[PDB]
Design an enzyme around this catalytic site. Structure first.
Site, short mmCIF file in Angstrom:
data_model
loop_
_atom_site.label_atom_id
_atom_site.label_comp_id
_atom_site.label_asym_id
_atom_site.label_seq_id
_atom_site.Cartn_x
_atom_site.Cartn_y
_atom_site.Cartn_z
N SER A 192 -4.56 5.84 -29.76
CA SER A 192 -5.75 6.09 -30.56
C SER A 192 -5.40 6.95 -31.78
O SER A 192 -4.52 7.80 -31.67
CB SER A 192 -6.84 6.75 -29.70
OG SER A 192 -7.94 7.16 -30.43
N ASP A 252 -9.24 -4.30 -12.29
CA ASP A 252 -8.54 -3.04 -12.60
C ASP A 252 -7.42 -3.31 -13.58
O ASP A 252 -6.30 -3.68 -13.15
CB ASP A 252 -8.01 -2.42 -11.31
CG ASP A 252 -7.33 -1.09 -11.55
OD1 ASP A 252 -7.45 -0.57 -12.67
OD2 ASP A 252 -6.72 -0.57 -10.59
C1 LIG Z 1 -8.96 9.07 -10.74
C2 LIG Z 1 -9.46 7.75 -10.27
C3 LIG Z 1 -9.08 6.51 -10.65
C4 LIG Z 1 -7.93 6.28 -11.36
N1 LIG Z 1 -7.64 5.00 -11.36
C5 LIG Z 1 -8.47 4.55 -10.23
C6 LIG Z 1 -8.29 3.59 -9.61
C7 LIG Z 1 -8.71 3.47 -8.29
N2 LIG Z 1 -8.36 2.17 -7.94
C8 LIG Z 1 -7.78 1.64 -9.11
N3 LIG Z 1 -7.74 2.49 -10.09
C9 LIG Z 1 -7.19 7.46 -11.87
C10 LIG Z 1 -7.75 8.76 -11.65
#
Ligand SMILES: c1ccc(NCc2c[nH]cn2)cc1
Length: 330
Positions: A199, A35
């Site tokens: 971007s 992540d």
């Molecule tokens: C909806 C879902 C995901 C994210 N980041 C997700 C996430 C979950 N675990 C680590 N990042 C942002 C909006």
């Protein structure tokens, strides 16, 4: 040193990718969601509330001769999708694709939210954003990349996510066989703890390119591409019968559609997301309404270049003293 590990989609939609990680002595292999939007390495464990474990592989620190309780340390994290986890902390030996870090903070979950329990394929997260976001208290801990950085041949990692196919995470080197053309580098702000960049604009399908600055984060742990409502409306206006559904929670489109591509700018370069990458399938089993892979970032407070965008590119996360991002076509 270097490391190289294969990352594999958890399901037929590429909802997320899992990468095997060796923890402890003897090794315990867990499949973690890498992540770049967070900075905690946390795992399902022998400490996780039993009713919140449903098919995950657990880390058992008492079986690792190199595990040490990090006395007094706790952690608790909330993700942009409303999911959460919390627990205590061990240090242990962690290896990814042959690259070993000793004394890595391994955050052991005591509690996880229902979405984590309900996903049997993800055994935890390995955060690769900046260590300033790490949630360990009272002593903040470093990411796996930050601990490895000084040992690496080059202070970089790369994300090469597949479309409906495995891909690769590399640490400490750039595989010049994995991309086409040249890598375009772009500035990063670390002020929010993310791989935040700007971007230079977008195009829809074969449409003309719109030059416009779009600030957002490169986030491997987010499935979709979240952009300003103006941009997202322009995209879905090119798909007959597409609409934003408050009941479903975003743009849906007829499953019979052929989707246009979406191009985003990186400096003077362009990354093209094929239309098929934007199809996330029926909203419910057997439905002819399909969920879109490009969604509004309105209310989220940041634009997110998630997997839908990143899987179209070879992406360099350059952790030099001044970090930068690189994008290449592939
Ligand atoms: C909806 C879902 C995901 C994210 N980041 C997700 C996430 C979950 N675990 C680590 N990042 C942002 C909006």
């Amino acid at each position: 040193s270097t490391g190289s590990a294969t990352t594999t989609p958890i399901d037929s939609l590429d909802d997320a990718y899992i990468t095997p990680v060796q923890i402890g002595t003897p090794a315990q292999t867990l499949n973690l969601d890498f992540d770049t939007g967070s900075s905690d390495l946390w795992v399902f464990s022998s400490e996780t509330t039993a009713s919140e474990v449903d098919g995950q592989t657990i880390y058992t620190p008492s079986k690792s001769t190199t595990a040490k309780l990090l006395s007094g340390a706790t952690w608790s994290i909330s993700y942009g999708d409303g999911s959460s986890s919390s627990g205590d902390v061990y240090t242990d030996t962690v290896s990814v694709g042959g690259l070993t870090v000793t004394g890595q903070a391994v955050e052991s979950a005591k509690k996880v939210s229902s979405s984590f329990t309900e996903d049997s394929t993800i055994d935890g997260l390995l955060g690769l954003a900046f260590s300033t976001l790490n949630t360990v208290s009272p002593t903040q801990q470093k990411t796996f990349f930050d601990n490895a950085k000084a040992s690496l041949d080059s202070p970089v990692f790369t994300a090469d996510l597949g479309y409906h196919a495995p891909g690769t995470y590399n640490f400490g080197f750039i595989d010049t066989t994995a991309y086409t053309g040249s890598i375009t580098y772009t500035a990063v702000s670390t002020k929010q703890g993310f791989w935040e960049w700007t971007s230079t604009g977008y195009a829809v399908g074969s449409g003309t390119f719109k030059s416009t600055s779009i600030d957002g984060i490169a986030d491997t742990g987010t499935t979709l591409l979240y952009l300003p409502a103006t941009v997202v409306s322009a995209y879905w206006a090119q798909v007959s019968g597409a609409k934003s559904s408050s009941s479903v929670g975003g743009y849906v489109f007829p499953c019979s559609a052929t989707l246009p591509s979406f191009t985003f700018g990186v400096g003077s370069a362009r990354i093209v997301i094929p239309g098929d990458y934007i199809d996330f399938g029926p909203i419910s089993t057997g439905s002819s309404s399909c969920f879109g892979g490009i969604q509004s970032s309105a209310g989220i407070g940041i634009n997110i270049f998630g997997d839908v965008a990143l899987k179209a590119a070879f992406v360099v996360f350059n952790g030099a003293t001044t970090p930068t991002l690189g994008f290449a076509s592939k």
